[PDB]
Amino acid sequence: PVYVDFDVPADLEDDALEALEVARDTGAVKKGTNETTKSIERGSAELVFVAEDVQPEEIVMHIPELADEKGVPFIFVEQQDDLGHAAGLEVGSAAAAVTDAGEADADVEDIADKVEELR
Amino acid sequence: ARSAYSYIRDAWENPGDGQLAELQWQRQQEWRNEGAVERIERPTRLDKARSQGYKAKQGVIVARVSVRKGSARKRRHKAGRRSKRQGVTRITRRKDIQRVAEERASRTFPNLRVLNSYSVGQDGRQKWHEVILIDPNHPAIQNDDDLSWICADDQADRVFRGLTGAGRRNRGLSGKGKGSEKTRPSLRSNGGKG
Amino acid sequence: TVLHVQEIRDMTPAEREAELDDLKTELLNARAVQAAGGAPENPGRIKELRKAIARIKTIQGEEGD
Amino acid sequence: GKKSKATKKRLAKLDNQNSRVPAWVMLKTDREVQRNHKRRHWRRNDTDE
Amino acid sequence: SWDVIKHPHVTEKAMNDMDFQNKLQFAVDDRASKGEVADAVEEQYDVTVEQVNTQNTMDGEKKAVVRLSEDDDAQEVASRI
RNA sequence: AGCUUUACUGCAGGCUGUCGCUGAG
């Protein structure tokens, strides 16, 4: 909430989540804030996911500002445990990253835009 | 590359700046309405917790503890005292608020033992510290190498004997040389002069 | 004396319970006599009735009844 | 005063402890034992409680 | 475990109740109720218990005055033991 | 030792300035 500066329309969210599962089978993804973080740092990040229900918030506060100075596009997920399930994990995940999608690029490509457009 | 953690940490260098500032201005509110000892499922400072011995495992608990701010709550003398000993206002306790917190917490969880603790802020009248505790009886811990040590009998009630880290520090045991003549190997063995 | 361990063990879980209740009743009447200024006693016996009972019980424990 | 079943038992024990040292013990001990070093008179003494 | 009946309370007064009211007096265990005392007796002696009065004695023991049914005879019972 | 006071020295308590809680124009 303190690091959330724009709300992602329920449906737009679905699209992002869909692209993730497909990217988890066509290409590569990063589960867990630590790995996500290093991606944004090692540039190897296309699109990153951040949950809206995380406590403590410290764990994620840095994602936005960090991404916003590395070009890497990022979108918000409302529930932490859907992101986990999407990434392919039993448990939930605070934030994940899509490293080289796969058959999800067009979608992602547009999501990246769709969001930029959502400011 | 910088671990994700390193950010959580760097953010607390100045708990009164940016996001962490507003975050505190918000939490403390829900905090000032919580109890004395509140078990919480996740550490507000993951870097620190993990650093001090935390581990998202079983038998590992955390709890936030508030303690009043200020000097000792002392009662004036009701019998003869020489001037030196008639003080009240400026007398302070020899055990830091952090240690006070580690104890209030440990007592709330009789079966557990204190592993460590760290600060998490303070408003105008109180201080909050989060305390990491351990179920010395859980097999998940009895089998973890980086922790099973705390199961030893001689580790029982360690916080009340000052074996905690904040304890050994508050005991003047930091330095190994000059200055620690009356602290090591023990305050009491040095006739309480440190 | 007028009862042994082996002999107590050569009984069946139903024979001891049987022997037990026997002694008790004997004991109880012994006491009844004493209570009424009993004289035709043989003190070394009312003492035994207690030890025997102990033994039968000790055994009911060991033998699993 | 109304007593309880517990109190009544204690008193009973006390009354009993307040008896002579059996005549025979004297002989059995060649008279080294004669006095009940615990005689408690109702008037002259005071029972706890 | 503890036994309900300790033994026959035998004294002049107990005799009277026996020879006059068909009553048998017993020294029983203090945790025993009247009903328990009743049963126990009808068993160890094979009779019919009509009524039972109890009293906690200054001896640390509980005395019970048991009255038998008109059929059974107190004297005849007590005689055998 | 109790007691007193414009005895000596201090300690509670009260009033007051300041700092922290403490932010917007």
Place this chain on the structure above:
RNA sequence: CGCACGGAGGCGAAGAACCACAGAUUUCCGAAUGAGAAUCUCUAACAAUUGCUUCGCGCAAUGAGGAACCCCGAGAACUGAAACAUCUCAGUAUCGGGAGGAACAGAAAACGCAACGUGAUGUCGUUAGUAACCGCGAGUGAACGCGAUACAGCCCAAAC
């Protein structure tokens, strides 16, 4: 067949008594734990606080004791200063909390015989009534090093 040497009686060659280890039994109150209560009572019980959790007291923990010793907190006054306030008595007496068979300490952000040197920690001897403190009064008072004792070094957090 206790101390305990009486009387009556009994037990033991089916090896008793007696001693060693192991086991059985082991009332009520008692941390006292279903609830209450001057050791009893009333209608199934880990009361209470916790951990894990089949989220069910299901599996566990705590509580209390102990000669002193130990560790962490609270902390006098008589007294000495020939009065007395700092100082001293003394971090003593006493109080609160807690561990063990021993505790605590412990592998250098050390020492600083200043070195081309020592090498975790307790303790004992000495260093020394030295340095240092103090109405610079009365008093208070180490350490490094040295000789001994015994020696023992390791584990995470993070980077990947």
